[PDB]
Amino acid sequence: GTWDCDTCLVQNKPEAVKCVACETPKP
Amino acid sequence: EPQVQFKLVLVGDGGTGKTTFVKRHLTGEFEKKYVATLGVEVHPLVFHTNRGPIKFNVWDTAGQEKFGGLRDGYYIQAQCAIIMFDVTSRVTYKNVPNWHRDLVRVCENIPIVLCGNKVDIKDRKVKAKSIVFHRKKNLQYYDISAKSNYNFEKPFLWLARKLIGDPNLEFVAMPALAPPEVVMDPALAAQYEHDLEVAQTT
Ligand SMILES: Nc1nc2c(ncn2[C@@H]2O[C@H](COP(=O)(O)OP(=O)(O)O)[C@@H](O)[C@H]2O)c(=O)[nH]1
Ligand SMILES: [Mg+2]
Ligand SMILES: [Zn+2]
């Protein structure tokens, strides 16, 4: 499911492999 | 328990007091997160409501707004916003429509509060009568003074009510804020609030 970026706190789509806002890769 | 939180973008001309404002919230300052790629500090500001805590993750720029619009990444996934201007600088008010436009371009119709900052300064340039952009746009307006904590909670309370869909949501206690650096004359606050009421009847 969705995941929260640890760098900027934005919620990202389950399929996102990096934060839609700050580009930080999904852990 | 799933935590209730919202990305809040805080925009407006450089020098309007955005950083001073967000920093009033002491825990939000201590727990701020630096976003290197975007040059943003995200301040997690928790407010305690009658329905539990809510957290506004406030995106404060690193001054880049002085040199042009902000990048899409700054705006993306924003759930609400505060647009700030400086009541001692009319040009910052004139730029408010531009900020709103940039905001809505990326974020569509998210709840937005318009804030006129620095009302502690005696020689006020942008007075209640002139402040009408919010009327034209379905936005809520508040005078604020970042330096004195004046009306600090107002934008967040209004946004929380809108986001949660609960007109009766209340903050049960104020977050710990940096002690006022200037005094907001209560008589002056009373007058300003009165002036705003009068203006809303036009
Ligand atoms: N008198 C007064 N000065 C303020 C207030 N908020 C910010 N300032 C001053 O305005 C200047 C710019 O503030 P800053 O927070 O850096 O604005 P920003 O560029 O929008 O983030 C600084 O000198 C602040 O000390 C306020 O509420 N009252
Ligand atoms: Mg700033
Ligand atoms: Zn991110």
Report which secondary-structure segment, H or E, holds B98.
helix B96-107
Contact (CB, 8 A) for B82 and B11: yes
Please provide the DSSP assignment of B39-52 as one string. Answer: TEEEEEEEEEETTE
Residue B183: strand, helix, or coil: coil
Q: Which of B42, B73, B74 sits opposite A9 (nearest CB)?
A: B42
∠ CA B9-A4-B140 to the nearest 5 degrees? 25
Resolution of the entry in angstroms = 1.8
Pairing of strands A3-4, A11-12: antiparallel
Q: B193 is in which domain, residue-wise?
A: 1-202
Residue A15: strand, helix, or coil: coil
Residue bearing the CA closest to ligand 1, atom 13: B17
Find the CATH number of the domain harbouring A14: 4.10.1060.10
Strands (DSSP E) contained in B28-164 are: 33-35, 40-49, 52-61, 80-86, 112-117, 140-143
Q: A25 is in which domain, residue-wise?
A: 1-27
What is the number of helices (H) and of strands (E) in chain A?
Answer: 0, 2
Q: Which of B33, B73, B77 sits opposite A11 (nearest CB)?
A: B77
Residue B61's DSSP bridge partners are B40
Q: Please state the domain count of chain A.
A: 1
Q: Please state the domain count of chain B.
A: 1
Q: Which of B35, B40, B43, B45 to mutate to test the interface with A (most CBs of A within 10 A)?
A: B35
Contact (CB, 8 A) for B58 and A8: no
Find the CATH number of the domain harbouring B139: 3.40.50.300
Binding site membership of B for GTP: which residues? 13-20, 31-37, 63, 117-120, 145-147
Cα dist from B21 to B68, B106, B137, whole Å: 21, 24, 23
Structure-solving method: X-ray
- Residue B29, token pair as written in the block: 């300052």
